[PDB]
Amino acid sequence: EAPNQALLRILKETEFKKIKVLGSGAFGTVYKGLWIPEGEKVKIPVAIKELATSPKANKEILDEAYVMASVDNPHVCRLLGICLTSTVQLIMQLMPFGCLLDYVREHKDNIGSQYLLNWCVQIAKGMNYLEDRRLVHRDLAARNVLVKTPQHVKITDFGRAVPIKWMALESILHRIYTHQSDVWSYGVTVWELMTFGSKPYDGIPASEISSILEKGERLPQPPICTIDVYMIMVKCWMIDADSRPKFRELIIEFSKMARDPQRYLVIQGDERMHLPSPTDSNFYEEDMDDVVDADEYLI
Numbered sequence: 001e002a003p004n005q006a007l008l009r010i011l012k013e014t015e016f017k018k019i020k021v022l023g024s025g026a027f028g029t030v031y032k033g034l035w036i037p038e039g040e041k042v043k044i045p046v047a048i049k050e051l052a053t054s055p056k057a058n059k060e061i062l063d064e065a066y067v068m069a070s071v072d073n074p075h076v077c078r079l080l081g082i083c084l085t086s087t088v089q090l091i092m093q094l095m096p097f098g099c100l101l102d103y104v105r106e107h108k109d110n111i112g113s114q115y116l117l118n119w120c121v122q123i124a125k126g127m128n129y130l131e132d133r134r135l136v137h138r139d140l141a142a143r144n145v146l147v148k149t150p151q152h153v154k155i156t157d158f159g160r161a162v163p164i165k166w167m168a169l170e171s172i173l174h175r176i177y178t179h180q181s182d183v184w185s186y187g188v189t190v191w192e193l194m195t196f197g198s199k200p201y202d203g204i205p206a207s208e209i210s211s212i213l214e215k216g217e218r219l220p221q222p223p224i225c226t227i228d229v230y231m232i233m234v235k236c237w238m239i240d241a242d243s244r245p246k247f248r249e250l251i252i253e254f255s256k257m258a259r260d261p262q263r264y265l266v267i268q269g270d271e272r273m274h275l276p277s278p279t280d281s282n283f284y285e286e287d288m289d290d291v292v293d294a295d296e297y298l299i
Ligand SMILES: Cn1nccc1-c1nc(Nc2n[nH]c3ccccc23)c2c(n1)C(C)(C)OC2
Pocket: 022, 023, 030, 046, 047, 048, 049, 090, 091, 092, 093, 094, 095, 096, 098, 099, 146
């Protein structure tokens, strides 16, 4: 098939400053930082993932870099480069608002219908691109959607390609992963958004989900959802994978809705709700001179 002509950019350690720790766990530690290419007179806000050295860990971080460097879409997270220190470091464009799951939980009192519907379009665009690239995500969830600006989200953690509660029925029973099992997870992601970060099948142990789905029970209709929106989620949760919507259809359907959002989502005090915007002033710590976003920096 087609040769993967993606460029793997190797970055010098001396070209990037670590500022603060955004997270830490099993994967290692993620830092907020700046990338300053020598003589370029640019400072690019970045997220840096660093790993002690073991041959197993290094193999895993490089498979992640291969996938991340292979994608290029406005609604998918891309790798900027890698740093070849003792433990390999992955450099990515900073998504300053964090992940969508925590964003909806923390900002539920100001998330209006235009935002939820546009996020649904953006995630479907990202997913439709991954489909054109024949790349099955396998882990789509609201936690794996990053927020660049409240009006611009990008999918991530497709680079690892078990979350039973987001998985399709063919995936649970037979470990069948396709672009149509990705549609089921998309339906769950939408449910997460529409409920402002609620946990799907909360308090129901994972080893029971398969039987629940086989009996025909599904996630409930969120209070803000009209039957129009809920029918879409229900269509993502059909047993027949071919019956589920295509991402191309999801972009269209949610875009139609996004044009008259209050007809499709019923949110109390929707028209007086507001989030930060790049059309606003003061939207953009120490020296903020010469900083450019990675989306506007090309070579
Ligand atoms: C905030 N932001 N902006 C771009 C990327 C990220 C980010 N990446 C993460 N994991 C990564 N996965 N792959 C990477 C490559 C380079 C840098 C980071 C990662 C993780 C998080 N955020 C949190 C703290 C929300 O949890 C983990």
